[PDB]
């Protein structure tokens, strides 16, 4: 499979999540995603084909993971935007007020601005701390997907938000949305990963 930020993958033939960013760990290829998407050793599939397994994750507390893929997968420095792509150029962290977009299998590519950092989400499983909040909308299934600036600076992976009854927060005004992501920086250093860039 071609690994691109935003695409769907399934976990143990049950749940769906979105790919965050292609990365490497020495000769190992992988992608970063949300920790709540799978447990260590869960099987990830893309288009019905096994692509790898969860190598590590932290959730709750934090919300991160990386899936180590088979050597047959093709890592790409790109994030899906409809039928087009955003090139990943690095991971400079944007400040409050910067514009940012996110990509995932449920709502596609949505943009907004970062509104707050170091937010705590109180999920049924336990608190997740240190999240960054944006007002781009998101839906069930977008978790793990890419958050990136139009300039290509990868910001983190989707964790959660104030989902409404229709499964997203897209039918409420930007001012009322809370869409949270896990910062990418700490995930790269925690697992010794390098981002694939182009």
């Amino acid at each position: 499979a071609n690994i691109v930020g935003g695409i769907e993958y399934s976990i143990n033939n049950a749940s769906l999540c979105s790919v965050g960013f292609s990365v490497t760990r020495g000769a190992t290829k992988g992608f970063v995603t949300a920790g709540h998407c799978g447990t260590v050793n869960a099987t990830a599939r893309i288009g019905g084909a096994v692509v790898g397994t969860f190598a590590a994750r932290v959730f709750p507390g934090n919300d991160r993971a990386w899936v180590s893929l088979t050597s047959a997968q093709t890592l790409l420095p790109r994030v899906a935007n409809g039928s087009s792509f955003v090139t990943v150029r690095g991971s400079t962290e944007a400040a409050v007020g910067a514009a940012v977009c996110r990509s995932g299998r449920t709502t596609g590519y949505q943009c907004g601005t970062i509104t707050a950092k170091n937010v705590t989400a109180n999920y049924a499983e336990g608190a997740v701390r240190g999240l960054t909040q944006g007002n781009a909308c998101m839906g069930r299934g977008d978790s793990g997907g890419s958050w990136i600036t139009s300039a290509g600076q990868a910001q983190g992976v989707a964790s959660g938000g104030n989902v409404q009854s229709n499964g997203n927060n897209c039918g409420i005004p930007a001012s009322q949305r809370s869409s949270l992501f896990e910062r990418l920086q700490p995930i790269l250093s925690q697992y010794g990963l390098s981002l694939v860039t182009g």
Binding site: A34, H36, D63, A121, N122, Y123, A124, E125, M138, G139, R140, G141, D142, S143, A158, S159, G160, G161, N162, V163, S178, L180
Partner: peptide, 4 residues
């Protein structure tokens, strides 16, 4: 808030 809920995960996703």
């Amino acid at each position: 808030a809920a995960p996703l």
